[PDB]
Symmetry: D2
Subunit: 323 residues, 4 copies
C-alpha cells in the first residue's frame, strides 16, 4: 500500500492514542514545507521580473519561509512558543491559539548560498512544553533528549521530508504533480560504517589536533585501507542527509572564529542528532552527546560530529587520546 | 523589459541573420531541459508507488532517470532537424541522425549525472556543447572531434533548489531561471562575468594521498596562506554543474586534476570539460589542463578525459605558478 | 486564519469525538481527487505524444475514466475505513478484503462527464459516504440505503479551477485546490443556495419527448405569465458543472423522466443522492417529482432516478406544475 | 515525431520566409496564455487566504497579454475587450501587427468555475501612417492568424493560419504546448445546437423556426441535443470538436447581437472557415463585415457547414 505523510502521521497518532494536537502540528508543518518548496523552486518568479508589466531576494525568501512556518504553526492551535533562526527573540503564541508544544526551527538556510542554487533546507524539532509557567523563551531550553519529533526538508533535486519520532526515521518524497509527500524509505537505519567524510577543510589552520589527526587518518589510513571520499555542500541539511543515506561522518567542530562551534544547538544540531540517534547513528560534541547538552540560550552554538557509529566512535577515540 | 529564453534566442538568431536552424536546436534543448527538470523533481512518483494500484519501483531508479534524460535530449535534438551527430556521456558510440532529419550541428552532452554523483539528491545537471559540422563527409564520430575553441554555444542546466539554465555564446553568458508555474525560462542575469579572484576552492580532498605534488602545494597555500591572509573556504558537491556554477557565481577555483594514476584526469573533454571551459572563458575566467587551455585540446576519442582547473583568472594563474614550480 | 481541507476535516473529527476512521477516509478521498485533477489537466501528455521516444510510456496509457476509478478505489481501500464500494464503472459492489476493512460504505462516480472530455468540458468526481448498519458480512445490500442515511457527500469539479464541495451535518463547505502546493484551501464556509434564481438547466434538444409537466414549467420560464423577465438557459451537459452553477448562482437543474425513460437517466446512488444531500444541506431541494430524492429506498445499486433540484422557490414551482398534471 | 507550439510556429515562419516578427508575436502570446492558465487554475490562492499571515483575474489577464505583446516588438495597435480605446504601442517597441483580443472571455461567471478562455485575432497594418485605432478596423478576411486558448478541464490553444487549424495541449508538467491534432477539419454536419434558449420570447422568427427543426426534424432523423455553457470559447470549441452549430443571434437587449466582432466573432469565424466550417451574421459572412467601431457587436451563427447552410436556408425564407 502506498503511504502518504498525512496518512502516516494520522495512523501514528491513532496508535499513540493522542488527542490529535501533535497530528495537527505535523500536518501544519507539512503544508508549510510544501509552500516553502514552491517558493524555493521559484514559482511565480516571472511576475517579479515584469511579465504582467511590473532587493535582497535571498533574505526575502528566508523571511517568507519564516512567515509560512510561523503562520502555519500559530494557526495549528498546537504551539505556545516558537524559536526560529530568523527571529532574535522567541515568539509567544497569542493565548487564544495556544497549544502544548514548543517548536524550534530553521525555516531556510539561504542567506549565504542560495545564489548558487544548490541546496537549502528546513530543520525543526518539537518539544512538549515542560514547565507550567507562563510561556517564554525558557520553554525552548530543553535538552535534545526531550524531543518528541524532529526532522528536516531538503529542497534539492527533489524535495524530501525526513521525520524522526519514537517509531524511527521515515523519508517522504514530495510529488509536485499532486502536492503529496509519498513514503519512500521506511524505518531508515544508517550504515554502521561509511566511506565519506564531510567538513569545511578551509578551517584546517584553526582545527584542534583531534580533528586534524582524525581527518589525516581518513586521507592517509594507517592500515593502508582505501582513503575516504570527501564531500561538503555547506548546507547542513544536504550534508547530513548524504551522511544518513550513504553513511560516514559529518563534522562542524569548534574553531577559532567559533570556539563554541558554529552550528546552532536548538534548531540545527539537536534535530539532526535526534534523527541520527533514531537511525542508529551517533552525534557528539566531543565531550558529550549533543542531545544531552542543557541549553541556556536559544541561539547558542554547539560543535557537532555525527553519523555512522563506527566513524563517530573512531573520532571519539582520537579525541580521548588528545584529552 | 521581461525576457524569456525563447525570445532571447530568437532575437539573437535574428541579429546574426540565421536561417533558424540553431534557434530550433536551442528551443528543442530548452524543452528537453524542462522535461528533465520535471522528472528530476519526481513528478508522478506517487504512481510509481501505487497510488492507482499499479506499482513499479523496479530497478536502479537513478540509472532510469539518467536514461530517460538521455532519451529526452536525443529525441528532442533529433526532431529539431538541426543536428547530424550526437555524442552523449550515456552512449558508447556517437549517434548518427537519420538522413531525413539531419541538420548542420553536432551536439555533445551529458544529459544527467545521477549515476556518477552520490550527492544526486542535492543536485544534478545537464551539460551541452554545440558545434557546426565542419566537413561534407558522411556524418560520423569524427565530426565531434573538434577543439572547444570551435564551439558555437555551450552551457548547462542546474537542477538544484531551483532550475537554472546557463547559456554561453559569442554574445557572452546569460542565466535563466525556470518558472515552474508557467514553464518559461526567465532571464535573470545578463552578460555574466566571473570575479577576478575568489575565496573558495573546490576539489575532492579524499584523493589527497595520490595528489599531484602541485595540487598538494596549491591547496596547502589555500589552507595556510603564506602571507597570512585569510584561508579560502572549501566546497565540493561532486556534481560538476553545481561546483562549476558556484565558481561562476561566487568566484574561486575548481580542480579535477591529473595524477600519476590518472595522467589525463577523470572528467571527459567533449561534454564536461569543453562546455564548462567555454562558459568560463566567455565569463572572463580561465580553464586549463595545466599544459594548455582546455578549449585548445584537439580530441582523438569522443570519450577522452582531460584534467581541468577552472575559475577566476587570478586563482587559475596562481595554480599555474605552482604547476610550473613542479614541472 | 487560513484553513486547509486536512485541518478542517481533522478539526471536525476531533469535535465529533471520532476515532479517526472517517477522517482517514476523507483524507484518502482528497488525495485521489488531487491525482485525478492532475491527470484531467493532462500532466504528462507530452510523454504520450513521444517527447522521449516511443518506449517511455503504465498508468500513462489508461483513459481518464479508468485511471480515476483506479485512483478512488485504491485510495479508499488503503484508507482502512471502508468495507463496501460502489462505482459507476463496476457492475457489482466491491467488498473490501477483511484486513483493510472499515465501517464505511462509499458510492462514487469517479469521473462524471468524461463521455465528453474530448471537448475539454468540465468534469467531476461525485461521492456519498454511509456507515454500515447491518449485522452481516459486508455485501452489496449495505449500499442500498436511502440518501437520508448519508454521513457525508460531495463532489470535486475540475473546471477552470479544481474545487471540492463537502457536505456534512455541519453544512456545505467549498475548498479550492491550490496547484502550487497541492492543498485544498477553504474559500467558502457554510454555503447556502439562493431562495430563488434566474437560470434553468436541462437538455432542451429532447423537447419532443418531454413530460407534459416539464413542458409547461419550461414554458413558464421562457414566457412568464406575470410578464416578468424570462430565465436564462444553461446546459453544460456535465452534471457536476451544472449542479455547481445551480448551487453558486441559484436556479433549477432538471434531468426528469419521460416515457422513454420512466425513471430518468442519472443514477440514484452515486449521482442523484450526493447532489441531493449537498442541495438540502445548502437550503435547496431535490425531488423526483413524487418524493424527495433522499427518501427513495433503492433496490439496485445502479438504479436510475429522476432529479429536479435547485433553489427552493424554483423547485416548489415545478412541483406545483407537476402536481397539476397529477 | 513530437511537436511543440514553439517549434511548429518557428517552422511555419521559416517556410513563409518571415523575418521572425510574427513568430515573436506568437511566442509572446503563448507565454501570456500559459501565465493566464496558471492564474485561472488558482496557483497561489493560498497566499491570498493568509497562508503566510498576510488584481482581479481579467485585469491580470489583460496585463499579461498587453505586456507580452508590447515587449514582442511585433505590434503597433492593441484592441482589448477590457480597454475602451485602442492601445498604441510606443515607437521603440513598434512592429507591424495589430492584435485584437479578449483576455478572458466568460470571466464574469468565473465564480462558478465555468470554462473561460482567451481569444485573439492578428492583422497586419496596411498604411504607412502613424498607427491608430482605425488600423484595427479591418474585415476578418484580412487576418493573418487567429485562435483561442480554452482553460477547460485542460488548457488547449487552437491556432488558425493559412496552413489550417492546429490544436495544442498545455502539458502542465513541463509548461509546453504539445501539438495533439493537426490540420483539423470540422464535421460536415453535427448533432448539437448551442444557444441561450432563455431569449426564446425575443427570437427572430428564423431562429425560432430553425430551432424547431432541430427538436422536430423534418427528415426522419433524431433530434439534436442541446448544449449551452455560456462561455463562447467553450461552446465554440465543442462545436469544432463534435461538429454542430452555435448561435448568438439578434435579441432585444442586443439588437445586433451581443458578441464583439473584432475579438470574438472574427477569430472564431476564421478558425471555423479554416477548418472547413462557416460563420454568418445571417446576411453575410462574419469575415466580410467591415467594422466601423472597435467594440461593435455582430450576430453570429457558426459551425458545421451543412448546419449553417440549413440555418441560412430558413433565414432567407423569412428575409
Ligand atoms: N501523529 C502522531 N504521530 C506520532 N506520535 C504522536 C502523534 N500524535 C500524538 N503522538 C504522541 O502522543 C502524545 C500526545 O499527543 P497529543 O494528544 O496530540 O498532544 C504526543 O506528545 C506524542 O508522544
Ligand atoms: N539563436 C541564435 N543565437 C546566436 N547565434 C545564432 C543563432 N542562430 C544562428 N546564429 C549564428 O548564425 C549561424 C547560422 O545559423 P543557422 O543558419 O541557424 O545555422 C550559427 O552557427 C550562429 O553563428
Ligand atoms: N473528520 C470528521 N468530520 C466530520 N464528522 C466526523 C469526522 N470524524 C468522525 N465524524 C463523526 O463521528 C463518527 C465516528 O466516525 P469514526 O471516524 O469512524 O469514529 C462519524 O461517522 C461522523 O458522524
Ligand atoms: N511563424 C509564422 N507562421 C506562419 N506564417 C508566418 C510566420 N511568420 C511569418 N509568416 C508569414 O510571413 C509574413 C511576414 O512575417 P514577418 O516578417 O515576421 O512579419 C507574415 O505576415 C505571415 O504571412
Ligand atoms: Mg535561516
Ligand atoms: Mg551521465
Ligand atoms: Mg456519470
Ligand atoms: Mg468577452
Amino acid at each position: 500500500d502506498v503511504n502518504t505523510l498525512t496518512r502516516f502521521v494520522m495512523e501514528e497518532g491513532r496508535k499513540a492514542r493522542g488527542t490529535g494536537e501533535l497530528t495537527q502540528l505535523l500536518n501544519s508543518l507539512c503544508t508549510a514545507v510544501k509552500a516553502i518548496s514552491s517558493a524555493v523552486r521559484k514559482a511565480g518568479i516571472a511576475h517579479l521580473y515584469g511579465i504582467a508589466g511590473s532587493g535582497d531576494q535571498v533574505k526575502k525568501l528566508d523571511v517568507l519561509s519564516n512567515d509560512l512556518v510561523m503562520n502555519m504553526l500559530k494557526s495549528s492551535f498546537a504551539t505556545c512558543v516558537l524559536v526560529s533562526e530568523e527571529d532574535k527573540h522567541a515568539i509567544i503564541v497569542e493565548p487564544e491559539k495556544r497549544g502544548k508544544y514548543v517548536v524550534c526551527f530553521d525555516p531556510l538556510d539561504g542567506s549565504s548560498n542560495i545564489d548558487c542554487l544548490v541546496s537549502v533546507g528546513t530543520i525543526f524539532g518539537i518539544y512538549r512544553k515542560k514547565s507550567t509557567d507562563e510561556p517564554s523563551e525558557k520553554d525552548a531550553l530543553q535538552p535534545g533528549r526531550n524531543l518528541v519529533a524532529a526532522g528536516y526538508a531538503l529542497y534539492g533535486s527533489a524535495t524530501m521530508l525526513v521525520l524522526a519520532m519514537d517509531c524511527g526515521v521515515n523519508c517522504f518524497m514530495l510529488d509536485p504533480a499532486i502536492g503529496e509527500f509519498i513514503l519512500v524509505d521506511k524505518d531508515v537505519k544508517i550504515k554502521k560504517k561509511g566511506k565519506i567524510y564531510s567538513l569545511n577543510e578551509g578551517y584546517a589552520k584553526d582545527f584542534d589536533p583531534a580533528v586534524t589527526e582524525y581527518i589525516q587518518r581518513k586521507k592517509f589510513p594507517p592500515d593502508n585501507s582505501a582513503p575516504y571520499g570527501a564531500r561538503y555542500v555547506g548546507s547542513m541539511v544536504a550534508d547530513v542527509h548524504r551522511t544518513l543515506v550513504y553513511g560516514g561522518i559529518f563534522l562542524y567542530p569548534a574553531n577559532k572564529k567559533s570556539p563554541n562551534g558554529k552550528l546552532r544547538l536548538l534548531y540545527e544540531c539537536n534535530p539532526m542528532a535526534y534523527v541520527m540517534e533514531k537511525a542508529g547513528g551517533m552525534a557528539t560534541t566531543g565531550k558529550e552527546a549533543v542531545l544531552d547538552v542543557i541549553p541556556t540560550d536559544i541561539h547558542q552554538r554547539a560543535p557537532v560530529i555525527l553519523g555512522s557509529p563506527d566513524d563517530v566512535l573512531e573520532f571519539l577515540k582520537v579525541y580521548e587520546k588528545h584529552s
